[PDB]
Amino acid sequence: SSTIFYRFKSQRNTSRILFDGTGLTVFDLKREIIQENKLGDGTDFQLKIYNPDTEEEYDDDAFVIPRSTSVIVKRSPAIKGNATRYVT
Amino acid sequence: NTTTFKFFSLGGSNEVGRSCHILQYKGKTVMLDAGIHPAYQGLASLPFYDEFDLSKVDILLISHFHLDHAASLPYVMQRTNFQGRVFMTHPTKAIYRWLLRDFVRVTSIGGLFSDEDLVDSFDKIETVDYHSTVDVNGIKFTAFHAGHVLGAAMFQIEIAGLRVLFTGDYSREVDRHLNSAEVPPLSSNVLIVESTFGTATHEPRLNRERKLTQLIHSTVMRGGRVLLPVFALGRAQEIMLILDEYWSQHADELGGGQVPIFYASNLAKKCMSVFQTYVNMMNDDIRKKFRDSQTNPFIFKNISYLRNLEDFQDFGPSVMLASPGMLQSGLSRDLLERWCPEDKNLVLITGYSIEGTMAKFIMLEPDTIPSINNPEITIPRRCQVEEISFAAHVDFQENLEFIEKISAPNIILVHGEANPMGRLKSALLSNFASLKGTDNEVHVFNPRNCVEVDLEFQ
Ligand SMILES: [Zn+2]
Ligand SMILES: [Zn+2]
């Protein structure tokens, strides 16, 4: 019923995360992106979400991103410094 | 007055796997290799491409066809903003053609390769001859012999006087069919060299071969079947040369149908014909016997080819060279789950088992292993597990001697786990402690992934 557009920064095509309501938390969006793409338990990478225009990061997992928004996704090495919190 | 040389890896730094390194100097960008991590599948197996604008890469060089160096190339050329040119040696491309379909399937887990994408995924790849310099918009590069496997190359790159040598994976011990790595005639300011075995030492070839032949000979005599997990091709041909010669040395005991040898892979027929057509690019020891008997030494008398297990009658001892090498899936895993419940069967690992794979896990001798078709049902592992390296990597002494012959003032270590890499660094810094503080002081770097190493030059 609702959707958030995302694209990995090195990739050409854009994908969707489907959900219900006005928006998604940065936390749930990261969790869905990880599970939809089978990225793993989070010990091997970090996942960060960015604004395509301002290039600023969504650094607060409690922020609610409104429906129909687009974001850039970057999967980086693990340095908590990883992505395990979006899996447990 | 000085300009910055920039190095950073998207993968394969402080680890073995998903090799991909970037060089920038005077507005030019070079990418070295494009592999995957055999411990993962889909995008999880890829280098951290999101951390770099791939559209800025001018040339992309592929050292050899192994999965941790080339399996990410179809993804780079099809799904990313990469637009530069791709180069590899002729045998590498000829071999890469048949690994292409399996490489795509590993990275596309989260579709399947078609004949239409064969134009962009393969035909666009350009080939270089050894010792023939190519110039692409001010970036010169030259392929040198590396050993390791057929088609493998070291690349010396020159950008505005600065010279960088990338070894890829290389060996210096004389192979039974490969030319060993060579020292480029011209000096290099930066050396990027592998660190797989760290400060460890390996035994000479004549010792590893005798240890390998006597081990298998003892196993098959007692009724045990031997499974050798190997990559689709490359080092597997070296083992086949050792076994086909040894089997005829003892043809009275194991000749004919007595314990047959099997090369199990869905690339068995085509992988051979590539080897038999690139003999002229091999060492003089193999072309002499190719000229002596005038018959191809890669036509094995005591080895038969098997493409699947659908019509494989398995009774009696037999030696099985099966792919994939890390036993992550495919055939070799199917026979592993079939032969490991018996205590006198032998699983002999001959290559480098990457962290997180079943080949690495089986060397810890677990009580059970999880079945591939469903994980929560275990299979008892009673078989004997051994390891005799034929991975064709330099050991400590071979690596240190080659590094000393290059004599670059800046060494960047890649392609090794953190502990063996860190021990190699200490030994190098200690070996070069005399020059410390002088004009020929050697700097050694062991960067992690996506960590920039900045060097200033003229
Ligand atoms: Zn290799
Ligand atoms: Zn490698």
Numbering used by the authors:
A (entry chain B): 2 to 80, 99 to 107
B (entry chain A): 5 to 114, 126 to 473
Give the original sentences from the paper that presented this experimental model.
Cleavage and polyadenylation factor (CPF/CPSF) is a multi-protein complex essential for formation of eukaryotic mRNA 3ʹ ends. CPF cleaves pre-mRNAs at a specific site and adds a poly(A) tail. In contrast, there is little mechanistic information available on the nuclease module, which is composed of the endonuclease Ysh1/CPSF73, the pseudo-nuclease Cft2/CPSF100, and the multi-domain protein Mpe1/RBBP6 (Casañal et al., 2017). In vivo studies and reconstitution assays using extracts found that many of the CPF subunits were required for nuclease activity (Zhao et al., 1999) and that Ysh1/CPSF73 is the enzymatic component (Chanfreau et al., 1996, Dominski, 2010, Jenny et al., 1996, Ryan et al., 2004).
To investigate the molecular details of the Ysh1-Mpe1 interaction, we determined the X-ray crystal structure of a complex between the catalytic domain of Ysh1 (residues 1–473) and the UBL domain of Mpe1 (residues 1–120). The structure was refined to 2.3 Å resolution. Ysh1 adopts a globular fold comprised of a metallo-β-lactamase and β-CASP domain, similar to the human 3ʹ endonuclease CPSF73 and yeast Cft2 (Mandel et al., 2006). Residues H68, H70, D72, H73, H163, D184, and H430 comprise the active site, coordinating two Zn2+ ions with octahedral geometry. The catalytic core is located in a large internal solvent-filled cavity at the boundary between the metallo-β-lactamase and β-CASP domains, with a narrow tunnel leading to the surface of the enzyme. The UBL domain of Mpe1 consists of a central α helix flanked by a curved 4-stranded β sheet and capped by an additional pair of short anti-parallel β strands, in the same configuration as the UBL domain of the human ortholog RBBP6 (root mean square deviation [RMSD] = 1.36 Å over 452 atoms; (Pugh et al., 2006)). Mpe1 binds to the Ysh1 metallo-β-lactamase domain next to the active site tunnel opening. A large basic patch is formed by contiguous surfaces of both Ysh1 and Mpe1, suggesting a possible role in RNA binding. However, in the structure, Ysh1 remains in a “closed” conformation that is unlikely to be catalytically active because the active site tunnel is too narrow to accommodate the entire RNA substrate.
